[PDB]
Amino acid sequence: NLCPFGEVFNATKFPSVYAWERKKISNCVADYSVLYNSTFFSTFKCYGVSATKLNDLCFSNVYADSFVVKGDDVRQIAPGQTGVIADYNYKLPDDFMGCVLAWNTRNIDATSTGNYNYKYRLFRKSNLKPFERDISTEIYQAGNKPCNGVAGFNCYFPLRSYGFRPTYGVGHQPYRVVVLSFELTVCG
Amino acid sequence: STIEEQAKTFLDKFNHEAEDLFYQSSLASWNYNTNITEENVQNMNNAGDKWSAFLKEQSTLAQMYPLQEIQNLTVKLQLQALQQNGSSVLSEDKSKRLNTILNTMSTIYSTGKVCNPDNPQECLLLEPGLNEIMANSLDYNERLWAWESWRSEVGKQLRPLYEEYVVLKNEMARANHYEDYGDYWRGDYEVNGVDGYDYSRGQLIEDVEHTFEEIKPLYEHLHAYVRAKLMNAYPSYISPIGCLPAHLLGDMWGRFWTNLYSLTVPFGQKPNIDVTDAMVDQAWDAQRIFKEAEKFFVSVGLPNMTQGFWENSMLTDPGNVQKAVCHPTAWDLGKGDFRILMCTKVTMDDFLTAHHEMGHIQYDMAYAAQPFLLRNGANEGFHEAVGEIMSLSAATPKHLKSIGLLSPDFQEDNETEINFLLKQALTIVGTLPFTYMLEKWRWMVFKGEIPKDQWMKKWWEMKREIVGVVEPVPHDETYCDPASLFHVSNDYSFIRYYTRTLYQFQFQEALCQAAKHEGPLHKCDISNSTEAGQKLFNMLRLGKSEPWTLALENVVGAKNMNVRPLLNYFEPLFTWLKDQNKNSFVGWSTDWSPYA
Ligand SMILES: *[C@@H]1O[C@H](CO)[C@@H](O[C@@H]2O[C@H](CO)[C@@H](O[C@@H]3O[C@H](CO)[C@@H](O)[C@H](O)[C@@H]3O)[C@H](O)[C@H]2NC(C)=O)[C@H](O)[C@H]1NC(C)=O
Ligand SMILES: *[C@@H]1O[C@H](CO)[C@@H](O[C@@H]2O[C@H](CO)[C@@H](O[C@@H]3O[C@H](CO)[C@@H](O)[C@H](O)[C@@H]3O)[C@H](O)[C@H]2NC(C)=O)[C@H](O)[C@H]1NC(C)=O
Ligand SMILES: *[C@@H]1O[C@H](CO)[C@@H](O)[C@H](O)[C@H]1NC(C)=O
Ligand SMILES: *[C@@H]1O[C@H](CO)[C@@H](O)[C@H](O)[C@H]1NC(C)=O
Ligand SMILES: *[C@@H]1O[C@H](CO)[C@@H](O)[C@H](O)[C@H]1NC(C)=O
Ligand SMILES: *[C@@H]1O[C@H](CO)[C@@H](O)[C@H](O)[C@H]1NC(C)=O
Ligand SMILES: *[C@@H]1O[C@H](CO)[C@@H](O)[C@H](O)[C@H]1NC(C)=O
Ligand SMILES: [Cl-]
Ligand code: NA
Ligand SMILES: [Zn+2]
Numbered sequence: 001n002l003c004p005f006g007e008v009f010n011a012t013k014f015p016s017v018y019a020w021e022r023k024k025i026s027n028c029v030a031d032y033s034v035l036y037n038s039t040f041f042s043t044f045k046c047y048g049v050s051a052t053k054l055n056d057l058c059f060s061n062v063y064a065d066s067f068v069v070k071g072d073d074v075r076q077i078a079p080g081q082t083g084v085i086a087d088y089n090y091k092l093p094d095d096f097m098g099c100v101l102a103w104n105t106r107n108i109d110a111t112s113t114g115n116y117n118y119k120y121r122l123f124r125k126s127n128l129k130p131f132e133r134d135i136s137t138e139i140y141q142a143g144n145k146p147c148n149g150v151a152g153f154n155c156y157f158p159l160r161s162y163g164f165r166p167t168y169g170v171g172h173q174p175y176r177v178v179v180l181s182f183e184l185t186v187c188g
Numbered sequence: 189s190t191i192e193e194q195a196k197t198f199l200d201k202f203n204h205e206a207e208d209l210f211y212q213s214s215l216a217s218w219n220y221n222t223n224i225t226e227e228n229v230q231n232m233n234n235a236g237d238k239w240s241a242f243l244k245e246q247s248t249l250a251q252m253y254p255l256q257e258i259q260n261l262t263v264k265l266q267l268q269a270l271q272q273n274g275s276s277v278l279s280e281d282k283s284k285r286l287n288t289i290l291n292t293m294s295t296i297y298s299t300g301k302v303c304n305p306d307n308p309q310e311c312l313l314l315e316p317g318l319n320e321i322m323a324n325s326l327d328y329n330e331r332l333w334a335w336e337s338w339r340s341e342v343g344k345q346l347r348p349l350y351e352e353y354v355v356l357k358n359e360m361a362r363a364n365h366y367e368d369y370g371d372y373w374r375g376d377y378e379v380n381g382v383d384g385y386d387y388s389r390g391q392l393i394e395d396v397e398h399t400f401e402e403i404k405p406l407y408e409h410l411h412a413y414v415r416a417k418l419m420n421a422y423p424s425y426i427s428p429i430g431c432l433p434a435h436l437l438g439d440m441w442g443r444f445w446t447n448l449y450s451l452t453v454p455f456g457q458k459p460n461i462d463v464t465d466a467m468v469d470q471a472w473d474a475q476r477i478f479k480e481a482e483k484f485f486v487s488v489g490l491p492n493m494t495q496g497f498w499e500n501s502m503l504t505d506p507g508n509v510q511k512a513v514c515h516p517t518a519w520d521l522g523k524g525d526f527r528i529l530m531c532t533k534v535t536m537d538d539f540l541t542a543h544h545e546m547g548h549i550q551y552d553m554a555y556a557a558q559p560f561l562l563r564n565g566a567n568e569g570f571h572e573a574v575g576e577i578m579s580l581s582a583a584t585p586k587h588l589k590s591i592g593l594l595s596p597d598f599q600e601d602n603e604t605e606i607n608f609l610l611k612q613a614l615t616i617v618g619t620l621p622f623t624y625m626l627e628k629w630r631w632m633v634f635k636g637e638i639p640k641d642q643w644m645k646k647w648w649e650m651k652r653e654i655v656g657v658v659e660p661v662p663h664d665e666t667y668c669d670p671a672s673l674f675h676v677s678n679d680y681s682f683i684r685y686y687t688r689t690l691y692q693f694q695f696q697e698a699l700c701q702a703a704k705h706e707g708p709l710h711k712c713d714i715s716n717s718t719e720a721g722q723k724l725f726n727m728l729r730l731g732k733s734e735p736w737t738l739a740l741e742n743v744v745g746a747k748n749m750n751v752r753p754l755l756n757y758f759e760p761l762f763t764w765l766k767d768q769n770k771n772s773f774v775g776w777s778t779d780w781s782p783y784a
Binding site: 123165167168172 | 194208
């Protein structure tokens with residue numbers, strides 16, 4: 001059977017970067033011709049493997065991570081980055097083997113009144129491990145005095161909204177990202 | 189947690205939360221300036237008051253971090269910007285009355301209109317009524333009427349409001365650890381923290397006066413040449429040794445002598461460089477003007493204009509179906525949104541202005557990576573200087589011939605260059621004594637050196653001595669002629685126009701050396717110079733992170749403003765003026781008046 005790549009790429013709803021979702025791909029034959037022979041993507045950057053030789057290859061299972069970030073934050077979805085998205089939202093390992101695909105979604109993910117649904121984590125104790133996921137909304141304590149669950153001075157809410165609008169620059173427009181991870185069932 | 193680390197996290201919250209509210213306030217005022225309706229004027233105020241209330245909340249929130257406990261110089265600048273109490277240091281009633289007089293002065297300046305005693309049904313306001321008279325009329329009495337009526341009608345009303353304006357502004361600056369309101373304005377040039385690049389607020393007064401002494405010889409010869417030409421235009425009205433009457437200078441205040449070119453042109457027989465008719469015959473539209481300006485910045489190494497610029501800018505007049513303010517402005521709404529508001533027409537004056545406003549956008553695009561509180565020019569004069577050097581290169585005959593707007597057989601005689609330099613000097617160097625004297629008068633008023641009973645007495649004593657301009661009719665303390673200018677009655681500093689003028693020629697000389705120019709400085713075009721573009725971009729990206737003395741050094745190689753590049757630009761004209769004034773009187777007597 002064909003692997004359901006349309007369920008992640010052509011998915012109607014996409015999650016926030018802080019609460020990115022992962023989908024496991026098990027016994028099915030893959031078809032990377034759809035992903036490779038298309039100019040719809042804005043980046044499409046592969047690491048550890050090539051964008052063409054993958055057709056005649058097999059893996060134990062494939063993991064598809066999906067989320068939404070700004071245009072300038074797409075560069076952080078790569079091995080060896082230290083931005084806010086890479087440190088507090090979604091981090092890739094140094095020995096990552098896969099491809100990162102992103103495309104502009106200004107027409108569906110950005111509204112005139114401001115789309116504040118897509119969020120991201122701005123404050124967190126230490127960085128995230130590779131492939132770690134944090135959905136905690138606990139009040140971040142930046143000062144020495146305790147917060148006591150009520151955000152205040154030196155006590156900030158950990159999540160902030162992107163606030164996408166169609167008149168923003170290309171670097172601030174919403175981009176849907178799909179990270180395909182390869183682990184060593186799935187063949188071409 | 190370290191106070192330095194707590195402040196960094198606080199700035200992270202601010203930079204992300206302020207960038208979103210600043211975009212809503214900027215887009216709200218954009219929808220008003222491009223579509224003047226009542227629904228949009230309230231949305232501009234709602235998003236404006238929301239940004240003001242947000243900025244005040246973060247102001248007191250930032251004050252809870254001791255500025256002395258921070259060692260990082262970059263974060264220390266951001267905290268100091270937010271910790272400014274500003275106008276909120278006054279009481280609830282004094283701050284409300286201060287905004288009341290600030291609005292009343294701005295109102296009566298824009299709505300004040302004078303009527304002709306000869307024809308009472310003919311009443312004209314400043315724009316375009318009185319400005320058209322001061323710029324075109326050659327009648328002594330007609331210009332004297334428009335000059336005196338503007339200072340006796342709308343000027344006398346500003347006198348009581350400006351008195352309360354000074355005392356309230358002084359109560360603000362003295363409460364924020366400043367000497368006076370003039371010391372508050374000079375704080376824009378203040379640098380304190382970097383060894384070898386510091387600059388005190390009092391150092392500005394010393395440097396502006398030291399550089400102005402070297403401008404006196406060039407201005408005195410220009411003043412003597414203009415006076416000789418003005419005597420032929422107004423015989424039996426001007427003394428060959430006295431100051432120039434104020435109502436004969438080209439505009440309402442004598443700020444610019446541009447309108448005197450028709451009366452002071454050295455060689456009127458030679459062809460004027462107006463390429464307006466050329467582009468109309470070559471099928472140019474408003475889109476082509478900005479496309480050609482975009483190609484100019486790309487030729488020097490700067491990037492293209494963003495897609496959002498071509499999608500969101502208003503480059504043409506929407507007409508009677510949508511009223512809009514046609515003041516050419518460059519908008520930086522943030523979040524990658526760069527726009528330009530300009531009702532562009534197919535003329536040469538709009539072609540050069542397109543390079544000026546797009547120069548502001550290239551400056552905004554450069555420091556976009558800096559944090560929010562650092563996305564601004566080095567000082568108040570850096571931004572206008574960047575836009576002016578573009579119009580200097582775009583106005584050279586070498587650039588106009590290369591594009592196709594000037595005929596290839598246009599001969600550049602030594603008299604055409606004197607005609608061009610004389611036109612530049614009437615606008616550039618003619619405003620320097622006016623700018624310095626005006627800000628010097630307000631500095632003394634704020635400092636407390638000019639009592640109220642001799643405001644206008646000392647105002648015209650400096651006009652005679654510094655600018656060399658005498659009033660046509662005597663004015664007592666009932667008048668308030670300085671307030672009759674926009675920048676004075678609308679609470680704007682004016683020394684920025686003096687510093688920007690010296691900056692733009694230091695930049696030009698620095699870029700033309702990187703551009704490998706070899707001829708005179710006024711014939712230089714920095715087109716195709718990726719070295720000059722890289723040299724200029726190295727300072728545009730700094731924004732306000734590094735001190736202006738360091739940013740200026742990154743391009744011109746000097747830690748302070750210099751007047752030498754300004755004199756080299758007008759050097760061929762300075763030697764020509766000295767030859768013309770060999771049988772004239774260079775200088776003026778501060779005692780002659782057209783009414784003694
Ligand atoms: C004052 O504080 C700022 C930040 O709070 C300091 O700037 C920071 O300097 C570090 C060290 O270079 C930068 O880390 C680097 O980030 C890049 C990002 O790609 C990474 O590739 C490097 O490997 C390195 O980790 C950091 O980004 C930078 N932060 C900012 C906002 O510019 C600055 O050095 C401090 N100044 C003093 C005098 O302590
Ligand atoms: C340096 O700057 C100049 C002027 O900005 C650039 O030269 C211009 O290049 C265009 C096309 O590349 C020329 O248009 C062509 O002109 C010839 C001769 O007039 C005409 O026969 C053609 O039909 C076409 O219209 C333009 O003339 C030319 N101008 C000059 C003064 O040479 C040049 O590209 C820049 N150098 C760079 C960017 O390396
Ligand atoms: C998404 O739908 C388009 C419809 O044109 C199709 O071409 C594409 O292959 C689909 N994506 C996937 C991953 O199947
Ligand atoms: C102008 O304002 C009206 C209502 O005030 C609005 O319907 C219209 O869309 C606006 N046009 C633009 C171009 O903003
Ligand atoms: C602002 O005013 C408050 C009034 O209580 C004062 O405590 C604070 O020190 C002032 N800020 C500065 C920077 O002077
Ligand atoms: C700028 O845009 C033009 C097309 O409008 C293109 O030919 C050129 O390569 C672009 N330059 C850069 C530096 O993006
Ligand atoms: C220009 O040069 C010519 C001869 O080279 C000379 O006769 C003329 O006086 C010069 N004009 C000026 C304004 O210097
Ligand atoms: Cl005046
Ligand atoms: Na005139
Ligand atoms: Zn400007």
